[PDB]
Design a protein around this ligand. Sequence first.
Ligand SMILES: [Mn+2]
Ligand SMILES: [Mn+2]
Ligand SMILES: [Mn+2]
Ligand SMILES: [Mn+2]
Lengths: 154, 154
Amino acid sequence: ERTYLYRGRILNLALEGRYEIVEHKPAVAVIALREGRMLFVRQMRPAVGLAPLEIPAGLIEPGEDPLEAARRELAEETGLSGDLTYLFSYFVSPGFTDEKTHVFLAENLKEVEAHAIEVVWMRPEEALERHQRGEVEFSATGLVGVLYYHAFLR
Amino acid sequence: ERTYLYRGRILNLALEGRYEIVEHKPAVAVIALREGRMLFVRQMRPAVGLAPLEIPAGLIEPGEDPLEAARRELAEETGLSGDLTYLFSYFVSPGFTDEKTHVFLAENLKEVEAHAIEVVWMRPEEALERHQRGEVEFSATGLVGVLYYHAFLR
Ligand SMILES: [Mn+2]
Ligand SMILES: [Mn+2]
Ligand SMILES: [Mn+2]
Ligand SMILES: [Mn+2]
């Protein structure tokens, strides 16, 4: 049984026996390549005090399925639309939270909207080199995008 | 400024203005291949109500650096030691937590200890196929291991 210590905006904190559990909405993330550049985004993230390299991502809102949320986040964060294909999912940190991320590939991108979030097109090889030299941090979604590219999109 | 709602065992919950922040110790994860099998582990994870496929992982304890924690988790979870090389790091979910994971490669594994955590040696190709067919869930660390193998270890 779970007893709730805090019910919030994008998380709840519960105790389940000895375990501390953070309930969190599920998320999506979108991997997109164009002319050998991957579509990264950066934003200040107060939890870490910096702007890591991420890919377009966000929470699934009421009424949405993961594909629909992926389309929405791509449009809202970058002004693009594409043909989306589901790839895989992962639990971000299942030792304490239930957040699950659904990852999609986007192809054939088109600008639909001419408009906080910085769009950072960057070759994945360069993102990995900058990270190895200490110049940028990754989110899980950014690292998954870079590794997926190296594994399957070259 | 952060105001603390909960100070716990492996997390704290804070508010920073409008933001809900979970402070969490940093973690390590170890990618290891032997005879084409990757070293996965599974354990019941009460936060998600299931046992995802992970790689050996754990929290960095007081006094340890990431390499030392990686050695310890490999030994404690699987009874092995190896030659460790640092690969990269990632923030698990920087929209709400500061947990950072440091990922290592282990080579030349040796059993040092004959002894909750299930050791699951499995070809990464098969782990990915089982996940695509809905048979297993991944943690971020398990998915990172599979993608890193496909990118760089074949
Ligand atoms: Mn976002
Ligand atoms: Mn912008
Ligand atoms: Mn562990
Ligand atoms: Mn065991």
